[PDB]
C-alpha cells in the first residue's frame, strides 16, 4: 500500500523541477481516493474514478508539484497557459486522476515563499511530460546577451510568492497527478 508517501509528503517539489515516483509490484487499495472527499478538484479523466478496486494496474506514476491557485485548471488535457505550456504539459491521451487541494498552512510565508519557481520564458513550447531544468539566460532581444542579465536579458525562472494573506487565486495548491495506463 504505497499511496502514503506521495500525498502526504512533506515538501512537494517546484513546478519546473516536478517530482515523480513509480508505483509497481503491489496492488493498490484506492480508498484514500473518492472516499475521504478531502480533495477539491478531482477531475479523473479516462477511467471513471469509483471502479478502481476491481481493476489492477502495473507501473503507474505519481508525479506531483505545487502551483498557484488560479492555475490549477491548467493541469488538464490541451489547456494553454503559463504553466501548462512552459512547465508541465499534459498530453491529449491522458488517463488518470488530477487531484488537487488547498494547502495554505504548509506552503506559504509571511513575505513571499520564493522557493517555488516557474519558467516564465522559453524558446518554444513543451512536449508532453518534457521537463526543463536548465537556467540559461533568455536574451529576449536580438542582441546576444551572454549571461549579463540586463536589458532584454531576463533570468527565465521567475519566482512565485505565496503569502498567507492573499485571495483565492494566489495560493499554493499541491497538485498530484495520478497517471494510470494499461499494462
Amino acid at each position, epitope marked *: 500500500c504505497p499511496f502514503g508517501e506521495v500525498f502526504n509528503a512533506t*515538501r512537494f517539489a517546484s513546478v519546473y523541477a516536478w517530482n515523480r515516483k513509480r508505483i509497481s509490484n503491489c496492488v493498490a487499495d484506492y480508498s484514500v481516493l473518492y472516499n475521504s472527499a478531502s480533495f477539491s478538484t478531482f477531475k479523473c479523466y479516462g477511467v471513471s474514478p469509483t471502479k478502481l478496486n476491481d481493476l489492477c494496474f502495473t507501473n503507474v506514476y505519481a508525479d506531483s508539484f505545487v502551483i498557484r491557485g488560479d492555475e490549477v485548471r491548467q493541469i488538464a488535457p490541451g489547456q494553454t497557459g503559463t504553466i501548462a505550456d512552459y512547465n508541465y504539459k499534459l498530453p491529449d491521451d491522458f488517463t488518470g486522476c488530477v487531484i488537487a487541494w488547498n494547502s495554505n498552512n504548509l506552503d506559504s510565508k*509571511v513575505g513571499g515563499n520564493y522557493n517555488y519557481r516557474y519558467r516564465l520564458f522559453r524558446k518554444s513550447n513543451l512536449k508532453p511530460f518534457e521537463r526543463d531544468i536548465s537556467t540559461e539566460i533568455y536574451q529576449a532581444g536580438s542582441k546576444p546577451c551572454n549571461g549579463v542579465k540586463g536589458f532584454n536579458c531576463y533570468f527565465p525562472l521567475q519566482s512565485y510568492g505565496f503569502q498567507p494573506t492573499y485571495g483565492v487565486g494566489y495560493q499554493p495548491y499541491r497538485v498530484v497527478v495520478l497517471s494510470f495506463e494499461l499494462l
Partner: antibody
Amino acid sequence: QVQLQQSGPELVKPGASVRISCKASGYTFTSYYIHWVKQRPGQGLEWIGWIYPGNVKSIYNEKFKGKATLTADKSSNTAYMQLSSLTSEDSAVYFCAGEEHGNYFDFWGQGTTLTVSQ
Amino acid sequence: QIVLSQSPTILSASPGEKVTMTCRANSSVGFMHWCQQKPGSSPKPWIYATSNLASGVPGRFSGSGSGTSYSLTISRVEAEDAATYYCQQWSSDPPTFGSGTKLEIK
C-alpha cells in the same frame, strides 16, 4: 563541506551600530532563506527575521523592528545583521540560519556572542 | 501569534528508560520539526516534519502527533544526550520555537 561561518565575538560600547558578518560556503547562496535568531543565556531561543538573497526582501519580528536592519551581498556570498541602538539587555549570541524547506533550518553558524560593555 | 507549550521543560530520567516530552500548540498548525542545541555550542537539525530523522541521529528518537498535539518519544535515554531539544512549527506565520526541554539525569 557545506557550512556557514560568521565573524568573531565582539564586546563594544552601548548605542553604536554594530555589524555581524556571515559567510556562505558550499551551497548555492542565492536560493536559501537566511534566518537569524537570538539566544539569551539561560533562556529559550527566539526569532529575529530573515532575508532572501535573490531579491533582498526582509521581514522582521515586531519586537525587533528598529533594533536591526538586515543586509546581504548577492555577489560576495555574505550576510549582515546591522544592529542598531545597542542596550545592556542585548547581551546574547545571535546565530545565522540558512534554510529552504519551510520552517526547518538546515545549517547554522559559529555563534557570535555579542556582550555589552560599560 | 502561535504560542507553544513544551510542558516537560525539566525532565529527570535515568538512562536506558522510555520517557517522552510533549509540545502543546495553539491555533491550527501543520508539522513540527525539531532541533537539538547542545549546551554552549551550535544547534543541530534533529528531526524532520514528524518522524523523518534527518540522517544524523540514533534510531531511538521518533516523535509522533498530528493536528494540534505533538510529542517526542525516546525509547532509551543516554548520558550522551544531556542536550536541549527545540521545536519549530510549519505554518504560514513566522516560526516560533518552544520553551525548552532540559533532558537531565538523576
